[PDB]
Amino acid sequence: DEKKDDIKEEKQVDKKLELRNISNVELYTLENNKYRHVSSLSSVPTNPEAYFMKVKSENFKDVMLPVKSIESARKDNQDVYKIVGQANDLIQHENNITLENYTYYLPK
Amino acid sequence: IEDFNFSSRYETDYKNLKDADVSRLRVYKNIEKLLPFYNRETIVKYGNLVDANNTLYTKDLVSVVPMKDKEVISDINKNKTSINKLLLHYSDNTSQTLDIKYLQDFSKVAEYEIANTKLIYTPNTLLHSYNNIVKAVLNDLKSVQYDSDAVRKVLDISSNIKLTELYLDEQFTKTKANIEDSLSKLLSADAVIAENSNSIIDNYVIEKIKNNKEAL
Numbered sequence: 524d525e526k527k528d529d530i531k532e533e534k535q536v537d538k539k540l541e542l543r544n545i546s547n548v549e550l551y552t553l554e555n556n557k558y559r560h561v562s563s564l565s566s567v568p569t570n571p572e573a574y575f576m577k578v579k580s581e582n583f584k585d586v587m588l589p590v591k592s593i594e595s596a597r598k599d600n601q602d603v604y605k606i607v608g609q610a611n612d613l614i615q616h617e618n619n620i621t622l623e624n625y626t627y628y629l630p631k
Numbered sequence: 632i633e634d635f636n637f638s639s640r641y642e643t644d645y646k647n648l649k650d651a652d653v654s655r656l657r658v659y660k661n662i663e664k665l666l667p668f669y670n671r672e673t674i675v676k677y678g679n680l681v682d683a684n685n686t687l688y689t690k691d692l693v694s695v696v697p698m699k700d701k702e703v704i705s706d707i708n709k710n711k712t713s714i715n716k717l718l719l720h721y722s723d724n725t726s727q728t729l730d731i732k733y734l735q736d737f738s739k740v741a742e743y744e745i746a747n748t749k750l751i752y753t754p755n756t757l758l759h760s761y762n763n764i765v766k767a768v769l770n771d772l773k774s775v776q777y778d779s780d781a782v783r784k785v786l787d788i789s790s791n792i793k794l795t796e797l798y799l800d801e802q803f804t805k806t807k808a809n810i811e812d813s814l815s816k817l818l819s820a821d822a823v824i825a826e827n828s829n830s831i832i833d834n835y836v837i838e839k840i841k842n843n844k845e846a847l
């Protein structure tokens with residue numbers, strides 16, 4: 524239970540990538556050698572890496588993210604699969620904390 | 632009703648930041664189009680760095696990047712060369728240009744600095760190579776005939792009805808000849824690809840273009 528005192532002046536703020544106005548996001552897969560829109564019902568954590576995250580917005584064009592990991596969780600005490608995109612420096616500023624990759628949750 | 636998105640992930644707020652200024656709200660909104668793909672801290676810092684004298688205060692729309700009035704689009708093919716000019720089409724239907732230099736790009740995003748007002752411009756592309764996709768699908772696009780049967784099937788046309796009512800055959804041959812550059816620019820300007828190691832997204836783009844080659 525120890526803390527370190529830090530003095531910091533923002534001469535150079537953190538220069539990282541972020542998605543500022545992301546709207547609903549799709550999801551795709553290579554389940555049957557063809558790219559199909561698996562919009563929901565990720566019943567089992569599909570262990571290969573044949574999924575990509577095609578986020579969509581309204582203030583600028585869509586962005587495509589190959590997935591990193593699929594993990595079951597309970598965002599609201601529900602069967603929810605946690606999925607994360609991969610990029611060199613992409614971060615998500617949610618709830619006053621910094622996440623090293625973009626993440627969203629499938630409720631259904 | 633929605634399903635766990637567009638509300639918790641919306642997070643477009645520019646108010647109540649560390650150095651947020653209510654007066655410079657529209658300044659931040661204008662500078663957003665100049666510097667996409669960056670954190671809110673950087674964007675508010677640069678908005679605070681905006682001089683009050685310059686015309687960035689008025690409403691701004693999407694900028695474009697011309698090189699001596701050539702209006703380049705393929706950033707990856709021209710990031711090394713200087714895109715000297717950068718038009719700023721404001722919502723007031725007024726056009727301004729600015730001197731631009733290339734300096735200190737990331738591995739993904741390219742940074743351009745404006746000498747006069749010490750601001751930064753970035754384009755809407757991650758400098759991702761489309762060489763793999765274009766080489767995969769080139770020779771497939773090259774084997775399409777304007778008067779063939781597949782092209783007729785793509786249209787809602789019968790075999791009897793002629794194609795002479797379109798007047799596009801010579802331009803069809805022209806676009807067959809120069810499909811390389813046009814396809815590269817389209818792939819650069821359609822969406823954003825952040826892939827680094829795998830090829831699943833590139834293969835998805837290849838499948839999408841291959842499925843509708845004649846329509847394209």
